[PDB]
């Protein structure tokens, strides 16, 4: 539940370059696939569950 982003999945470590103002991520099919931790400025990758 990262700052309103309510979703389930496998949070992994991705080498994605996020802009300073960009917080959320998405893809072609309009699905959240990357989030930013509001505590430490790291890059996460929400992936669908198994």
């Amino acid at each position: 539940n990262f700052n309103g982003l309510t979703g389930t999945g496998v949070l992994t470590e991705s080498n994605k370059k996020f802009l300073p103002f960009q917080q959320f991520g998405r893809d072609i099919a309009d699905t959240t696939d990357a989030v930013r931790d509001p505590q430490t400025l790291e890059i996460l990758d929400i992936t669908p569950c198994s």
């Binding site: 103002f21 960009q22 917080q23 959320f24 991520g25 998405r26």
Partner: peptide, 16 residues
Amino acid sequence: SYTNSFTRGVYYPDKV
């Protein structure tokens, strides 16, 4: 006077 805005005036619509 007047000018022409060729391809400028585009911003990021959302925060994604």
